[PDB]
Amino acid sequence: NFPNSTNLPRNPSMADYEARIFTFGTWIYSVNKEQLARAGFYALGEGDKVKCFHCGGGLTDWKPSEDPWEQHAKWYPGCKYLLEQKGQEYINNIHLTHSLEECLVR
Ligand SMILES: C[C@@H]1CN(CC(=O)N2CCc3ccccc32)CC[NH2+]1
Numbered sequence: 001n002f003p004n005s006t007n008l009p010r011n012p013s014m015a016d017y018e019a020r021i022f023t024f025g026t027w028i029y030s031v032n033k034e035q036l037a038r039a040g041f042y043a044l045g046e047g048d049k050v051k052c053f054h055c056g057g058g059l060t061d062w063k064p065s066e067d068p069w070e071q072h073a074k075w076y077p078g079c080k081y082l083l084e085q086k087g088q089e090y091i092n093n094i095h096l097t098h099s100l101e102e103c104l105v106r
């Protein structure tokens with residue numbers, strides 16, 4: 001499924017922080033559910049899989065060292081909600097960091 005890059009959310013029922021928070025329930029996983037919800041994510045109830053309400057972008061297998069906002073930017077750089085919340089300065093930082101990470105290792 002293609003990422004939504006319009007200013008209009010793919011899932012408006014999940015636009016409110018509160019609505020997103022309810023989707024998690026008891027959350028056993030290594031990443032913080034409030035932190036996920038703040039970054040626009042809601043739970044699908046499929047292990048630790050989340051989707052952004054806005055871009056629809058999905059993400060799984062959360063390691064303790066993976067930040068919701070950073071991962072949002074890594075995989076869904078066109079997300080208008082991300083751009084609104086964080087800014088383009090932050091998005092660029094994050095991408096430069098990841099590209100330089102995936103080059104320093106090799
Ligand atoms: C939290 C991170 C996420 N990583 C990428 C990931 O989960 N992606 C990348 C694109 C995609 C589409 C659909 C479902 C998942 C994913 C994996 C490691 N943990």
Ligand SMILES: [Zn+2]
Pocket residue numbers: 040052053054055056057072076079080081082
């Ligand atoms: Zn998004």
